[PDB]
Design a protein around this nucleic acid. Structure first.
Ligand SMILES: [Mg+2]
Ligand SMILES: [Mg+2]
Ligand SMILES: [Mg+2]
Ligand SMILES: [Mg+2]
Ligand SMILES: [Mg+2]
Ligand SMILES: [Mg+2]
Ligand SMILES: [Mg+2]
Ligand SMILES: [Mg+2]
Ligand SMILES: [Mg+2]
Ligand SMILES: [Mg+2]
Ligand SMILES: [Mg+2]
Ligand SMILES: [Mg+2]
Ligand SMILES: [Mg+2]
Ligand SMILES: [Mg+2]
Ligand SMILES: [Mg+2]
Ligand SMILES: [Mg+2]
Ligand SMILES: [Mg+2]
Ligand SMILES: [Mg+2]
Ligand SMILES: [Mg+2]
Ligand SMILES: [Mg+2]
Ligand SMILES: [Mg+2]
Ligand SMILES: [Mg+2]
Ligand SMILES: [Mg+2]
Ligand SMILES: [Mg+2]
Ligand SMILES: [Mg+2]
Ligand SMILES: [Mg+2]
Ligand SMILES: [Mg+2]
Ligand SMILES: [Mg+2]
Ligand SMILES: [Mg+2]
Ligand SMILES: [Mg+2]
Lengths: 117, 110, 150, 56, 18, 103, 142, 48
RNA sequence: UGUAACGGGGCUAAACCAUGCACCGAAGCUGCGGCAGCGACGCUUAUGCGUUGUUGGGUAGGGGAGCGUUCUGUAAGCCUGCGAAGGUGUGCUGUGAGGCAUGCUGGAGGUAUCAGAAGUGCGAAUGCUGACAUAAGUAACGAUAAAGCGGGUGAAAAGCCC
RNA sequence: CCCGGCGAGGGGAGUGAAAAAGAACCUGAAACCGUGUACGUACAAGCAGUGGGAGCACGCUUAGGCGUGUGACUGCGUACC
């Protein structure tokens, strides 16, 4: 029973091109390049769902460091004081507190300094 | 009211016509006939005839007096291309693709 | 495939893919790779397998009360109207009628009714027994059917 | 010499950005018949700078 | 309106022996 | 005012009336949930940095909805090694609204 | 809760003036590069320029340790064959003083549009006077 | 019981191994024949 | 071919040696969810239950379970001119192949469920056929014997007629 | 009927359920080539994407903010067979 693959093959091609929208040149018009582009994009997405965490954590560590050095202490010493003082605040928050409510972040500095002393 | 005119299977490639078509986009009709008249291309003659045809359409079939009219679109699309054969050298043959175009002129006094 | 066995062009020297025959399945209007031949799809069933399935079907028909046994089933004339009147009295629309011996009156009456089929006792088949909504078989047909199934 | 990769439509359109023709900026009006013509050229009726030069 | 195609091909070049 | 609490292995800084998205809780959609593990309560100028877990910390929240987040496609493919793999994932979430912070 | 991001429109940039007399070149350049990036601010964002404008006075009196005055060599290529050129530390400080701090600083920032954007935020003067009194720069002790 | 409600017994009909029909299939692009041996050639393989 | 024997800058410590106490640093580990495989249990077990313990990189290759396309019975049924198939969008949905529904074009088919049979799934083979690009408005327009003008016809004449 | 060369072609009118069936006539996809609109682009280096992300445009909501298009800038990243 001769089967014509036109309908199903067309559906497969069209589905791939839908995820390739916005790509430059032939990457959004031609199936051969679009197919390679979408699969390659999936590789990037898998790898970067871990790299996102990395880059984010990095950025935070930088803002907390700037605020701590603005208060007269280094990041490495600042973290040690919180650990000695049984404080479990996380990095993402501390960076948010450092930028949005500086008085509470300043209050944190004395507790860390006191535990170190 | 928008009135359209077409010249299909015009004996000129779309690439050559587009140079003239981009010259007259957005201009007054009276200016457009002047530029096309003193434009040294045969493709200018084809577009001028279609523009003149569109003016006669706007004037007679549809309403519109004169002056106020102005060209708003002049998109020119490709047309079916005949495929002749030109013998080359050492037996080689080539597919001479004589191309054609579709001149369209849309004018609205708005 | 009708055509010549000539090589379309020499093997090496031209700037195109190697070709060997105009009838290649890759080529347009070429041959079919695994072309079909006249086939015989009939399978073998053991006599016991056929009889075992028939007994299973008949037992299930009794269980769901789709089997009706009557003493006689006949029509005086070969008239479709007469048969239609008889089935309406018995409240039957989609029915298979099995008789002990073939009756010309019943066979002619049922020929133009697609919902009813008339068969002889030794002419039953598994597909018809399942296809029809209800099956009506006469009492005398039970005697031959029982002894041919043992 | 021959191409190693196919140039794109972007590059083709970008390259043709200098092929555009330039229109005549303005015509001149004959002082007698009043028709428009190319500068330093005779009119279609045979006038030039207000004087008939061609009898027809 | 009856165009066609034809190709025979020819073979020649230099030497590659060193 | 605002407070910081840890719920699902992660910490969130929330204020009264805010809607915050958390990991899925096994609580019916119309119900009240109590978070007694409050880490830090800030009242604008005076804070209570729990060391750890402020003693008088009570977070009052109202469960709003349960749902699945945006679809994420996992694509694994090793080039030239005749290997490929694709997979979808939707993460369950619970949306709660903070109704009261009491110290 | 999305992480805070500095807005380039609403970022506040301040003006500082730094005197480079007698300070070690690399140790001084690090503080400028740090402050040009904005690493000293809690609103620091890697893709946003949050740094400050820095004016450097007395660029000709910067000091280096060891024998680096005569042994450290600055190479550059003109792109033409044989166009390799070199200048010693003293000679550049004489001919074109400012050219020693800026190259070190430009090489000390990230490479890209922001690194070039931070670089522009550096006004280096060989002498002791600057023409930016309208910005009221604040003295910064390196 | 109807002719469109009948099923085979479990495990009485196993599927095939139509090869070279996709990376996912598991038998694609070589059909279980390995790489360029006698068994991979059309009509290839040694006699009994 | 250019510094080119710190990645670069720069460094007299921002080097080296010896002690410490910090921090950063992976898809490792731990948290908090989800899916799946497997093992002996508690009740109950073709089903399944706070199960629990533990496992889930992968070529050749082996095993298992599925999705979708044409066509056969179910089906003189079902859906459909109050709009079929196909086409083109959008939304929703499943672990995946996919599915559902809708706006629009299109105009008449289509077809549940579960069974069966296959010319059952394409990106590659200097694959085949057709269509369309690219180079490209580039080369070339076929002997360097040579053309010029007036008038005519014509919508239009360097090329036609005189 | 009108433009045009007593053309080609087209615009009306009319036929027809439909010319979104006009004889290059069912449907009419894709490559490819255009016109319009929104955003981005002339100090800027690389498989051209991905994660983050301002600004702009636009659709809902009522200021909870979401959605769509685009995407400066940034981390990481050298097609497939
Ligand atoms: Mg990590
Ligand atoms: Mg010849
Ligand atoms: Mg054939
Ligand atoms: Mg027999
Ligand atoms: Mg395998
Ligand atoms: Mg094998
Ligand atoms: Mg081998
Ligand atoms: Mg091989
Ligand atoms: Mg082998
Ligand atoms: Mg788990
Ligand atoms: Mg595995
Ligand atoms: Mg096939
Ligand atoms: Mg194909
Ligand atoms: Mg392949
Ligand atoms: Mg070749
Ligand atoms: Mg191919
Ligand atoms: Mg054809
Ligand atoms: Mg030319
Ligand atoms: Mg060229
Ligand atoms: Mg040339
Ligand atoms: Mg030439
Ligand atoms: Mg000639
Ligand atoms: Mg003449
Ligand atoms: Mg002519
Ligand atoms: Mg029809
Ligand atoms: Mg520069
Ligand atoms: Mg610019
Ligand atoms: Mg470039
Ligand atoms: Mg890299
Ligand atoms: Mg890179």
């Amino acid at each position: 029973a001769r089967v014509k693959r036109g309908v199903i093959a067309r559906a497969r091609h069209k589905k791939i091109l839908k995820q390739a929208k916005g790509y430059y040149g032939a990457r959004s018009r031609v199936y051969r390049v679009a197919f390679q582009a979408v699969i390659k994009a999936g590789q990037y997405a898998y790898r970067d769902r871990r790299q996102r965490k990395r880059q984010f954590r990095q950025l935070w560590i930088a803002r907390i460091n700037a605020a701590a050095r603005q208060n007269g202490i280094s990041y490495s010493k600042f973290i040690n004081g919180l650990k000695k003082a049984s404080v479990e605040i996380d990095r993402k928050i501390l960076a948010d507190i450092a930028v949005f409510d500086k008085v509470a972040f300043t209050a944190l500095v004395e507790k860390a300094k006191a535990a170190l002393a | 009211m928008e009135t359209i005119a077409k010249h299909r299977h015009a004996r000129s490639s779309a690439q050559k016509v587009r140079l003239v078509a981009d010259l007259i986009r957005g201009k007054k009709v009276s200016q457009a006939l002047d530029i096309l008249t003193y434009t040294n291309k045969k493709a200018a003659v084809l577009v001028k005839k279609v523009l003149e045809s569109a003016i006669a359409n706007a004037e007679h079939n549809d309403g519109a007096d004169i002056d106020d009219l102005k060209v708003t679109k002049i998109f020119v699309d490709e047309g079916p291309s005949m495929k002749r054969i030109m013998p080359r050298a050492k037996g080689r043959a080539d597919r001479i693709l004589k191309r054609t175009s579709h001149i369209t002129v849309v004018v609205s006094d708005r | 495939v009708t055509g010549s066995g000539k090589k379309p062009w020499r093997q090496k020297g031209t700037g195109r893919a190697r070709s060997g025959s105009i009838k290649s399945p890759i080529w347009r209007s070429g041959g079919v790779t695994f072309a079909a031949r006249p086939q015989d799809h009939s399978q073998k069933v053991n006599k016991k397998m056929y009889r075992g399935a028939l007994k299973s079907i008949l037992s299930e028909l009794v269980r769901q009360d789709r089997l009706i046994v009557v003493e006689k089933f006949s029509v005086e004339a070969p008239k479709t109207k007469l048969l239609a009147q008889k089935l309406k009295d018995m409240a039957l629309e989609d029915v298979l009628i099995i008789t002990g011996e073939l009756d010309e009156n019943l066979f002619l009456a049922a020929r133009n009714l697609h919902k009813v089929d008339v068969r002889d006792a030794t002419g039953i088949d598994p597909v018809s027994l399942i296809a029809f909504d209800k099956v009506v078989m006469t009492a005398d047909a039970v005697k031959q059917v029982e002894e041919m199934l043992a | 010499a021959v191409q190693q990769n196919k140039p794109t439509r972007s590059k083709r359109g970008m390259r043709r950005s200098h092929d555009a023709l330039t229109a005549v900026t303005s015509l001149s009006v004959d002082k007698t018949s009043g028709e428009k013509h190319l500068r330093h050229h005779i009119t279609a009726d045979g006038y030039y700078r207000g004087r008939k030069v061609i009898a027809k | 309106x009856x165009x066609x195609x034809x190709x025979x091909x020819x073979x020649x070049x230099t030497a590659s022996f060193v | 005012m605002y407070a910081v609490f840890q719920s699902g292995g992660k910490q969130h800084r929330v204020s009264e009336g805010q809607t915050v998205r958390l990991e899925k809780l096994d609580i019916a959609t119309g119900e009240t949930v109590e978070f007694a593990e409050v880490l830090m309560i800030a009242n604008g100028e005076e804070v209570k940095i729990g060391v750890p877990f402020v003693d008088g910390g009570v977070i009052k929240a109202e469960v709003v909805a349960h749902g699945r987040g945006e679809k994420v496609k996992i694509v694994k493919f090793r080039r030239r090694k005749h290997y490929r793999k694709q997979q979808g994932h939707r993460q369950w979430f619970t949306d709660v609204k903070i109704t009261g912070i009491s110290a | 809760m999305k992480t805070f991001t500095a807005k380039p429109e609403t970022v506040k940039r301040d003006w500082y003036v730094v005197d480079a007399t007698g300070k070690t070149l690399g140790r001084l350049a690090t503080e400028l590069a740090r402050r040009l990036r904005g690493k000293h601010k809690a609103e620091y964002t890697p893709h946003v320029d949050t740094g400050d404008y820095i004016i450097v006075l007395n660029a000709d009196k910067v000091a280096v340790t060891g024998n680096k005055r005569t042994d450290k060599v600055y190479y550059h290529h003109t792109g033409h064959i044989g166009g390799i050129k070199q200048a010693t530390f003293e000679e550049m400080i004489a001919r074109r003083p400012e050219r020693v701090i800026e190259i070190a600083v430009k090489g000390m920032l990230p490479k890209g549009p922001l690194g070039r954007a931070m670089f522009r935020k550096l006004k280096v003067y060989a002498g002791n006077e600057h023409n930016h009194a309208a910005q009221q720069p604040q003295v910064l002790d390196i | 019981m109807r002719l469109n409600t009948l099923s085979p017994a479990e495990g009485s009909k196993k599927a095939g191994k139509r090869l070279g029909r996709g990376i996912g299939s598991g038998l694609g692009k070589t059909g279980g024949r390995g790489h360029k041996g006698q068994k991979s050639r059309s009509g290839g393989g040694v006699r009994r």
